[PDB]
């Protein structure tokens, strides 16, 4: 019990690799039949990362309803997230169809299009406001409205238009640019400053559909974002913050999508992020301003 005393115990013993390997062994295993179907081979970026049949997002089309995406429904925390892979050149239309149908207002991107000299995600959004994107297959139009660039992250305002229904919606795009694959952010302050920017925007509100969170596979960096956010919500509605066990919350999350959190250091980071973030949730308003200064966003 209690995360802060548990953190110091594991760091002194140097057993982060053992604690993480135990979570992998205890992790749920459910079928991924639709994902392994031959017609869906080119819809998957990686052969080892597939959504479970029970929690997969279904597209609203009679042809093929598949997309490598999962709905993580956290009952007690009262929040849902959609974790998906970085879209492929042939799945960008499917990605935006999912955003429309699920009524999402925000998209959280934790990777870069090109990392370590390799293509990790397609350029699914327009880089220029005069060069809008039309997805002919799903009959959707996407235009860049504005962008607010900071040192380690970018916030974009996009307009998604359904051409069949003639309706328009504003989508907020939160892009973390300095988080390496299988790595961790620069500091808990830089991560939390980003997380609270997403919270204050109104994208995570239950009035809207689930927030779309992705990276390259949508399991490592994405699992870290969602684990830290869910743990902070729980210690605000329980009235006993010390009862929150990060390992039990991660195992509950892994019931909806395989491999959430990829390394031992990513789990260690989730602990640091929640411990530091608990200060604001507890009632100390001033630490949010301290995170902005230590993140060096200017």
């Amino acid at each position: 019990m209690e995360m802060e005393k548990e953190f110091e115990q594991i760091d002194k013993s140097g057993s982060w690799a053992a604690i993480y390997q135990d979570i992998r062994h205890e992790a749920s295993d459910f079928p991924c039949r639709v994902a392994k179907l031959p017609k869906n081979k080119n819809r998957n970026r990686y052969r080892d990362v597939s959504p479970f049949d029970h929690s997969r997002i279904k597209l609203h089309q009679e042809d093929n309803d598949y997309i490598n995406a999962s709905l993580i429904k956290m009952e007690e925390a009262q929040r849902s997230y959609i974790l998906t892979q970085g879209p492929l050149p042939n799945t960008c239309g499917h990605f935006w169809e999912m955003v429309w149908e699920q009524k999402s207002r925000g998209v959280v991107m934790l990777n870069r299009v090109m990392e370590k000299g390799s293509l990790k995600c397609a350029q699914y959004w327009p880089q220029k406001e005069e060069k809008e994107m039309i997805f002919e297959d799903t009959n959707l139009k996407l235009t860049l409205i504005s962008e607010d660039i900071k040192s380690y992250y970018t916030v974009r305002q996009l307009e998604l238009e359904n051409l069949t229904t003639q309706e328009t919606r504003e989508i907020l795009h939160f892009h973390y640019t300095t988080w390496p694959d299988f790595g961790v952010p620069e500091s808990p302050a830089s991560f939390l400053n980003f997380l609270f920017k997403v919270r204050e925007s109104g994208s995570l509100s239950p009035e809207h559909g689930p927030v779309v969170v992705h990276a390259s596979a949508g399991i490592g960096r994405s699992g870290t974002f969602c684990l830290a956010d869910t743990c902070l919500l729980l210690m605000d509605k329980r009235k006993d913050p010390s009862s929150v066990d990060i390992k039990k919350v991660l195992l509950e999350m892994r019931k909806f999508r395989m491999g959430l959190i990829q390394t031992a250091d990513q789990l260690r980071f989730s602990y640091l992020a929640v411990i530091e973030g608990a200060k604001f949730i507890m009632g100390d308003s001033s630490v949010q301003d301290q995170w902005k200064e230590l993140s060096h966003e200017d």
């Binding site: 970026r45 990686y46 052969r47 080892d48 990362v49 390259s216 596979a217 399991i219 491999g259 990829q262």
Partner: peptide, 5 residues
């Protein structure tokens, strides 16, 4: 196909 891990 490729593999992530």
């Amino acid at each position: 196909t490729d593999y992530y891990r």
